């Protein structure tokens, strides 16, 4: 029984899914630069400074993902809002997988 109010929630979730896509692109950009910077170019002290700049930016990505989660965690979806509940959870697990990617990077560089 599709209701007008669920569209409201599906719109929030779509707006949140597009932000999530921005941070996922940042995360792609980071991994790309990582690959290129670990690829030998610089003296090892200078690489380190480069890798610490990336680390801080992976930290911002992690943070941005958390802020999306925090806002997803403000939603209250009735059981009959099956479409919304599926989208909310798809999105949480997306972010969470992305968060594992971040940790994987952050965990290796700049200690």
């Amino acid at each position: 029984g599709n209701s007008p109010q669920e569209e409201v929630e599906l719109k929030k979730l779509k707006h949140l899914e597009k932000s999530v896509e921005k941070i996922a692109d940042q995360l792609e950009e980071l991994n790309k630069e990582l690959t290129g910077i670990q690829q030998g170019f610089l003296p090892k002290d200078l690489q380190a400074e480069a890798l610490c700049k990336l680390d801080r930016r992976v930290k911002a990505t992690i943070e941005q993902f958390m802020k999306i989660l925090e806002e997803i965690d403000t939603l209250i979806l009735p059981e009959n809002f099956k479409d919304s509940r599926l989208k909310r959870k798809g999105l949480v697990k997306k972010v969470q997988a992305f968060l594992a990617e971040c940790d994987t990077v952050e965990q290796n560089i700049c200690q």
Binding site: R57, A60, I62, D73, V92
Partner: protein, 377 residues
């Protein structure tokens, strides 16, 4: 134009009395308070919301709580005991504290009033963006228990920032002025100001007769605020996750943070309705945490904390030699004072005496300081 500025430990607020009415100015981000945060990066200085937002990516060169260091010497019991819990570095410059950071690569150091001038430049800039005039005159408030060095350190901070500090006014004096308490007639009136914010709790007794104020006494608890009530809910729901899923979430930072954020928000919801729902999908090991808390449960979790807010009250009255029956006005400031149970406890202390709480308690000090800067201006 003359503005009133509440220069808070955690957040600041700027008002301007204009068109017969105080307007609490919204910052560039649309918020009526501005975090009292300053962050140093490779490229720039950030103040307010921008500095708070990026405290996880740069906690070391992100400074806050400078109002706990301002006007103090380095071995103040207080500087010593908060240094323990600050990611930024407090150095000793011949017995005066200075915050040390990294800023565009050069290691820089700053007295607390340089950091507090930064926030006052923010608040000043904020008001000028709303007004489209230059802003230079301000009243800045301090706590009643502030000493001469702490009062002068704040005045300095304003002066370094380009403001003309018309006066330094105590925060409860500001709150009392907001409620036209200085306008009442004839006989001398005692005023208890109950200031419960996110992190601190300040009690003040003041006298007002004929619009003339005197601080009678000062009490409080330096580390009791809304943050302690959020933790009581966090503990409650961690124990509940453990009962239903036999999972311990508490070594997962991101799960606890998610929970704690939903806690704080649900707490606010509970000041205005009697039950709060929370849905956190995939909280820990993929398990959804859907729960709900009633206002009575929240109240019970915090029972000792709510009632213990009365020992600075009784203790402020001891110090002021006043019977609880000789307080003529009670005023609530700081956001945690919205909690009904607390408003209730307090009324039930003052044998059912009314309370001044109609002005947003986050806004009341800057409101009063606005009203007074227009008068001094």
């Amino acid at each position: 134009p003359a503005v009133g500025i509440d220069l808070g430990t955690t957040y600041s607020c700027v008002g301007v009395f204009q068109h017969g009415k105080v307007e609490i100015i919204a910052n560039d981000q649309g918020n009526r308070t501005t975090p009292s945060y300053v962050a140093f990066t490779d490229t720039e200085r950030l103040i307010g919301d921008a500095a708070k937002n990026q405290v996880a990516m740069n906690p070391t060169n992100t400074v806050f709580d400078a109002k706990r260091l301002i006007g103090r010497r380095f071995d103040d019991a207080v500087v010593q005991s908060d240094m323990k819990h600050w990611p930024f570095m407090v150095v000793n410059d011949a017995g005066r504290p200075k915050v040390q950071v990294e800023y565009k690569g050069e290691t820089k150091s700053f007295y607390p009033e340089e950091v507090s001038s930064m926030v006052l430049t923010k608040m000043k800039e904020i008001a000028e963006a709303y007004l489209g005039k230059t802003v230079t005159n301000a009243v800045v408030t301090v706590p009643a228990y502030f000493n001469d060095s702490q009062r002068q350190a704040t005045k300095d901070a304003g002066t370094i920032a380009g403001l003309n500090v018309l006066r330094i006014i105590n925060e409860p004096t500001a709150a009392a002025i907001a409620y036209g308490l200085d306008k009442k007639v004839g006989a001398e009136r005692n005023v208890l100001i109950f200031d419960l914010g996110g992190g601190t709790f300040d009690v003040s007794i003041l006298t007002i007769e004929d619009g003339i104020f005197e601080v009678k006494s000062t009490a409080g608890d330096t580390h009791l605020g809304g943050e302690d009530f959020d933790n009581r809910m966090v503990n409650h729901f961690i124990a509940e996750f453990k009962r239903k899923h036999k999972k311990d979430i508490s070594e997962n930072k991101r799960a606890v943070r998610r929970l704690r954020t939903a806690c704080e928000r649900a707490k606010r919801t509970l000041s205005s309705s009697t039950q709060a729902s929370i849905e956190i999908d995939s909280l820990y090991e993929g398990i959804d945490f859907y729960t709900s808390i009633t206002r009575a449960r929240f109240e019970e979790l915090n029972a000792d904390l709510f009632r213990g807010t009365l020992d600075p009250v009784e203790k402020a009255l001891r110090d002021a030699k006043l019977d609880k029956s000789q307080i003529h006005d009670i005023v609530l400031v700081g956001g945690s004072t919205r909690i009904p149970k607390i408003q209730k406890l307090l009324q039930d202390f003052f044998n059912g005496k009314e309370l001044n709480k109609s002005i947003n308690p986050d806004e009341a000090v800057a409101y009063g300081a606005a009203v007074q800067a227009a008068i001094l201006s």
